[PDB]
Design a binder for this molecule. Structure first.
Ligand SMILES: [K+]
Ligand SMILES: [K+]
Ligand SMILES: [K+]
Ligand SMILES: [Mg+2]
Ligand SMILES: [Mg+2]
Lengths: 205, 177, 201, 111, 132
RNA sequence: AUUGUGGAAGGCAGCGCGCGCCUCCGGCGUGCUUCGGCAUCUGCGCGCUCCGGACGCUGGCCUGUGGGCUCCCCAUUCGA
């Protein structure tokens, strides 16, 4: 993984059905190359091995604590967004200034809060479950894992996501109708544009 | 075009002596990655099977054997002897390939996978082109169907070349059998 | 005397014919007869007091046998070819290639009327030769050379008229090709997703 | 229509400064690793070999009536298999430039 | 119910490697991972299914046919015409055409697209005021 | 892509043009030849070249907000 190398002011990633570790490594490289990344819907991230194995792993993590002063760490974040953030931190030299700056360019959210609900969201094929996990093998959602280890906002995110999706469906229908109104416009413009369509014909899909 | 393993006929004999001016000529069909390694394994067997070491032997001829019809599919049976972690065993394997070189390559790959047997712990006893009606393994029989038909259950999604590779895409892959 | 080279070169520094063949072609056998059976022998081709003596002996550099060769012209660039300027104040503008000067630089014209680029010298390393060709048969630039662009501000009226004479013959050819006038009036630029190493010119 | 104010023609592509030529335990600042946008293979790198590079940054003081500074370089050879290149500059780039962008010009031109 | 199956006569597209973009016919199946493919302009050879994309075209041939028999079968089914006329097959052709446009051709296409967009936008405005 | 160390030598090597004619992408004389060819005749004069280690051209700038710096403070990546 060398990096995307694209010039963008900001990249918004939809993490739904992305493998946690593979998404983390790709994003870690993007952040280290100076790319600003926003990750939404972290509760829908997928972890291979299944809930039982992943739950046992987190419980072993909960055991780790400074015996003489538990407040001195390690800190066991329960929310999906923080778990992703901590997973990425393990793949970055976060104790150096270079690493700290890279982490400061990352933002993680559960669900899709504004203004990102109206911003195009991309996916990362190298981390997609449909391409990385064989159908029939165990996996769990990060939101489900977080709920069982002490994240109590799962329902709140679920209701807000349903409200957002219904609004998005309404907006989708408006664009769908606007597209049907535009295919008529081009047909009407066909008579005016005789030479222009000839040039575009060999290039049109 | 290119094969990992090549088949050679190696012909050799013991050095002529006053008692035997015309010693017996021995031939073997050996598999190796090149001629040099084919010769070395030829003397290994002659030393241990005919008591003729290379120091007192003579190399006569070495020729590579090529598949006759590399465009058709044949069923290949391979009789082999191999060493496990606790002893020696004999097994018979079948493969389907356009050339016996490919079938032998599959055999070495399978032995490494299913038995953790390295290349140097295998001796090929016999090879042959088996007709379809005389095959024994079901992995080979199930493809003896004039109406062979099945879908591609697992596909590999990727651009034709890395030139069209991008880290980010607007939509997920659309896959259907 | 001989009108053509006796020994054509298969490659640089290797002739097509051997020494034995060349002896026949050189005619040394004929020359030997005319000179009493002998090749004629020829003969080898036969201040002010200083005002100051240096304390240190002067050192003169050793002889170098390498001689510079004329700058080569890129195969993509042919007379009438449309070039894209990659640097300078005229970066991105599309000009018409006229000829190569003795210095190795390229002589180009906008033409000045279409894009405001006059008769100018552009280094070959800072241009891209496209596949578009505009006829320049009627263009006469035999009067133009390196000295025409040499320094010695108001541009003399003489050069403005010279620009128009060359320009006028070129406008008619440009007007013949549809949409070529607008093509030469717009600068080339890279947009999103445009990869220079994949662009065809 | 946008009404944007800025450069009207772009005759360069952006490249990201990834770091220096290095091993697991040593660093060689005299060579820099640059990722050129759009170049994803070693074969595609051949077009950019020898191309001039410009690292433009802003200083606090004014020199020649400007806060901009430029360090020039060029593409020397490819690095790896994924289109990364090795670049040399008149002076070694500072570590501060890691993650910054450089301009990859289309000259000197061989086409 | 699956739409495409690996079978003798199935036309497949090479989706990876040097042979990318070419059409081949599956004339025999070696195993689960490999098939024997043949095309008019290539020698019969094996290749992995990971480099093949099955199409909707399927000619009627017997197992491992002769080249002359294979060629006439493809022409009888208009394999090349069907593929190029299909939307999927046209995508590959258009991609090559776009990459092959020279600087002048791209300028002409820009003018046509700009003029096409301007007229279309005017038509939409009328469809908005009238058909609100 | 990196690089020009040397500053006494026009040397060494391979060729070209003249010193004989022709219709000039070539042709014309001995010896040898595998019949394609050949260091068999191939000397002198004047030149050329992948030939005893880089030369040439152009611009910028020259008391400036310029150039240089081994000095000072500090930041960052690597090392420690
Ligand atoms: K050089
Ligand atoms: K100065
Ligand atoms: K330091
Ligand atoms: Mg790396
Ligand atoms: Mg020197």
């Amino acid at each position: 993984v060398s990096g995307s190398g694209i010039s963008a002011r900001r990249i918004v990633v939809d993490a739904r059905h992305h493998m946690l570790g593979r998404l983390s490594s790709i994003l870690a490289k993007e952040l280290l190359n100076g790319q600003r990344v926003v990750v939404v819907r972290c509760e829908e991230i997928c972890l291979s091995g299944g809930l039982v194995r992943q739950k046992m792993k987190y419980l072993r993590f909960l055991r780790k604590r400074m015996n003489t002063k538990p407040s001195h760490g390690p800190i066991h974040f329960r929310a999906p967004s923080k778990i992703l953030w901590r997973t990425i931190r393990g793949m970055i030299p976060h104790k150096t200034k270079r690493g700290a700056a890279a982490l400061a360019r990352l933002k993680v959210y559960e669900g899709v809060p504004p203004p990102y609900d109206k911003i195009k969201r991309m996916v990362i094929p190298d981390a997609l479950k449909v391409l990385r996990l064989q159908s029939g093998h165990k996996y769990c959602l990060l939101g489900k894992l977080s709920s069982e280890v002490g994240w109590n906002h799962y329902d709140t995110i679920k209701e807000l996501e349903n409200k957002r999706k219904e609004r998005a469906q309404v907006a989708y229908e408006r664009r769908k109708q606007l597209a049907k109104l535009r295919v008529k416009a081009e047909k009407a413009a066909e008579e005016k544009l005789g030479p222009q369509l000839a040039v575009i014909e060999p290039i049109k899909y | 075009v290119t094969y990992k393993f090549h088949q050679y006929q190696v012909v050799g004999r013991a050095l002529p002596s006053e008692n035997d001016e015309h010693p017996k000529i021995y031939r073997m069909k050996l598999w190796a990655t090149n001629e040099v390694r084919a010769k070395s394994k030829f003397w290994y067997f002659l030393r241990k099977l005919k008591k003729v070491k290379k120091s007192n032997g003579q190399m006569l001829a070495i020729n590579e054997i090529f598949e006759k019809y590399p465009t058709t599919i044949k069923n290949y049976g391979i009789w082999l002897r191999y060493q496990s972690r606790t002893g020696y065993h004999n097994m018979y394997k079948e493969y389907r390939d356009t050339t016996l070189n490919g079938a032998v390559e599959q055999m070495y790959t399978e032995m490494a996978s299913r038995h953790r047997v390295r290349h140097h712990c295998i001796q090929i006893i016999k090879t042959a082109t088996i007709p379809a009606k005389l095959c024994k393994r079901e992995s080979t029989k199930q493809f003896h169907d004039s109406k062979i038909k099945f879908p591609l259950v697992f596909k590999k999604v990727r651009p034709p070349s890395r030139k069209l590779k991008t880290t980010y895409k607007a939509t997920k892959p659309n896959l259907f059998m | 005397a001989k009108k053509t080279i006796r020994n054509p070169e298969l490659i640089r520094g290797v002739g097509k014919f051997s020494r034995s063949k060349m002896y026949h072609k050189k005619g040394l056998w004929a020359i030997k007869k005319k000179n009493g059976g002998k090749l004629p022998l020829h003969e080898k081709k036969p201040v002010k007091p200083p005002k100051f003596y240096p304390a240190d002996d002067v050192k003169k550099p050793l002889v170098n046998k390498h001689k510079p060769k004329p700058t080569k012209l890129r195969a993509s660039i042919t007379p009438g070819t449309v070039l894209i300027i990659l640097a300078g104040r005229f970066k991105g503008k599309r000009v018409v290639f006229l000829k190569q000067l003795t210095s190795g630089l390229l002589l180009v014209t906008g033409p000045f009327k279409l894009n405001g680029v006059p008769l100018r010298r552009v280094n070959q390393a800072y241009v891209i030769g496209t596949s578009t060709k505009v006829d320049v048969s009627g263009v006469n630039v035999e009067k133009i050379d390196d000295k025409y662009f040499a320094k010695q501000n108001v541009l003399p009226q003489e050069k403005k008229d010279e620009q128009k004479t060359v320009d006028s013959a070129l406008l008619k050819a440009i007007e013949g090709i549809p949409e070529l006038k607008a093509y030469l009036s717009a600068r080339f630029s890279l947009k999103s997703g445009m990869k220079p190493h994949e662009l065809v010119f | 229509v946008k009404g944007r104010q800025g450069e009207r023609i772009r005759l360069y592509v952006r490249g990201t400064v990834l770091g220096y030529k290095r091993s697991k335990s040593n660093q060689y600042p005299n060579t820099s690793l640059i990722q050129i946008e759009g170049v994803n293979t070693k074969e595609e790198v051949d077009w950019y070999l020898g191309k001039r590079l410009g690292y433009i940054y802003k200083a606090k003081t004014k020199k020649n009536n400007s806060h901009y500074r430029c360090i020039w370089g060029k593409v020397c050879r490819p690095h790896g298999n994924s289109g990364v290149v090795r670049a040399k500059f008149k002076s070694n780039l500072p570590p501060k430039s890691m993650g910054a962008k450089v301009r990859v010009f289309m000259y000197p031109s061989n086409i | 119910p699956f739409k495409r199956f690996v079978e003798i006569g199935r036309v497949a597209l090479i989706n990876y490697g040097k042979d990318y973009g070419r059409l081949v016919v599956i004339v025999d199946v070696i195993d689960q991972n490999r098939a024997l493919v043949d095309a008019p302009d290539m020698v019969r050879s094996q290749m992995n299914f990971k480099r093949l994309s099955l199409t909707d075209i399927k000619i009627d041939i017997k197992r491992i046919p002769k080249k002359k028999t294979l060629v006439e079968a493809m022409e009888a089914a208009d394999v090349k015409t069907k593929w190029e006329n299909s939307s999927w097959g046209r995508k590959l052709i258009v991609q090559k055409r776009r990459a092959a446009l020279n600087d002048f051709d791209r300028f002409k296409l820009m003018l046509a697209k700009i003029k096409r967009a301007g007229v279309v936008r005017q038509e939409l405005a009328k469809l908005k005021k009238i058909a609100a």
